Amino acid sequence: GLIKHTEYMEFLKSVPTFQSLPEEILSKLADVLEETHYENGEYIIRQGARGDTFFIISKGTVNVTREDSPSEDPVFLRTLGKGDWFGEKALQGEDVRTANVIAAEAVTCLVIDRDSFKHLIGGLDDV
Ligand SMILES: Nc1nc(=O)c2ncn([C@@H]3O[C@@H]4CO[P@@](O)(=S)O[C@H]4[C@H]3O)c2[nH]1
Ligand SMILES: [Ca+2]
C-alpha cells in the first residue's frame, strides 16, 4: 504494498509496453508485484534457463551478458539500473532466457510472472 503503490505505479507506467494499459489494470499489476532482493554476483536470469518472470529494477544495477554458445564465456552487453527492466518476452510465453542478468551490487527488483500478467491483460479484448 500500500505504502509503495504509487511508486510501483510509476515504475510500471515507465515501461513502454505497459504505458497504454488502463489505469485499473496498472493498479492491479502494482498490487501483484513482488519485491525480490539479490546480492552482488547473483544471477537474476541465467541464459538457457526457462522462466516466466519480468523484472523492473527498483534498486542497484545489473550486468547483462550473453554467451554465443554454451562452451564460450559470456560477453558483457550492457548495464541496467533503477527504472530499467528485463525479461518482458517471458510474459508472452517466450520463456527461453537469451542472456544472463547478474546483480552488480545489492539489487531489488519488482517481479511479475506470466500467469499474474495474463490474468490481468487477457480480458482487454473482451471489454
Ligand atoms: N539477448 C539479449 N540481448 C541484449 O542485448 C539484452 N539487453 C537486455 N536484455 C534483456 O535480458 C533478458 C534475459 O532474459 P530474456 O531473454 S526473457 O529477455 C532479455 C532481455 O529482456 C537483453 N537480452
Ligand atoms: Ca520511478
Side-chain angles (χ1 to χ4, degrees), residues 1 3-31 33 35-38 40-58 60-81 83-113 115-117 119-124:
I3 284 173
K4 294 190 181 195
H5 185 75
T6 296
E7 162 187 328
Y8 290 171
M9 290 294 268
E10 295 165 351
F11 277 117
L12 291 166
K13 284 176 172 182
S14 302
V15 180
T17 296
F18 300 169
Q19 72 185 50
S20 293
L21 285 172
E23 192 70 15
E24 178 182 44
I25 300 305
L26 291 170
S27 186
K28 292 184 174 306
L29 285 169
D31 287 342
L33 301 181
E35 285 197 16
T36 60
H37 304 267
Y38 304 92
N40 184 22
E42 186 169 355
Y43 284 68
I44 303 170
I45 292 178
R46 184 59 173 263
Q47 182 178 346
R50 286 182 191 271
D52 63 354
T53 47
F54 168 70
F55 300 81
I56 303 169
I57 299 167
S58 61
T61 62
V62 303
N63 295 312
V64 182
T65 75
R66 185 205 67 236
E67 59 259 8
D68 300 330
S69 67
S71 56
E72 283 178 278
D73 295 346
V75 301
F76 174 75
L77 301 183
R78 75 189 77 255
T79 299
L80 299 172
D84 289 325
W85 60 86
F86 52 90
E88 200 288 328
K89 72 180 179 69
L91 298 184
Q92 285 80 240
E94 306 294 351
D95 67 354
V96 175
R97 302 301 201 178
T98 67
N100 308 294
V101 184
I102 309 167
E105 53 180 294
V107 165
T108 305
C109 291
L110 311 182
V111 187
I112 300 167
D113 62 287
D115 283 346
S116 301
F117 187 75
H119 175 72
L120 290 169
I121 63 84
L124 291 183

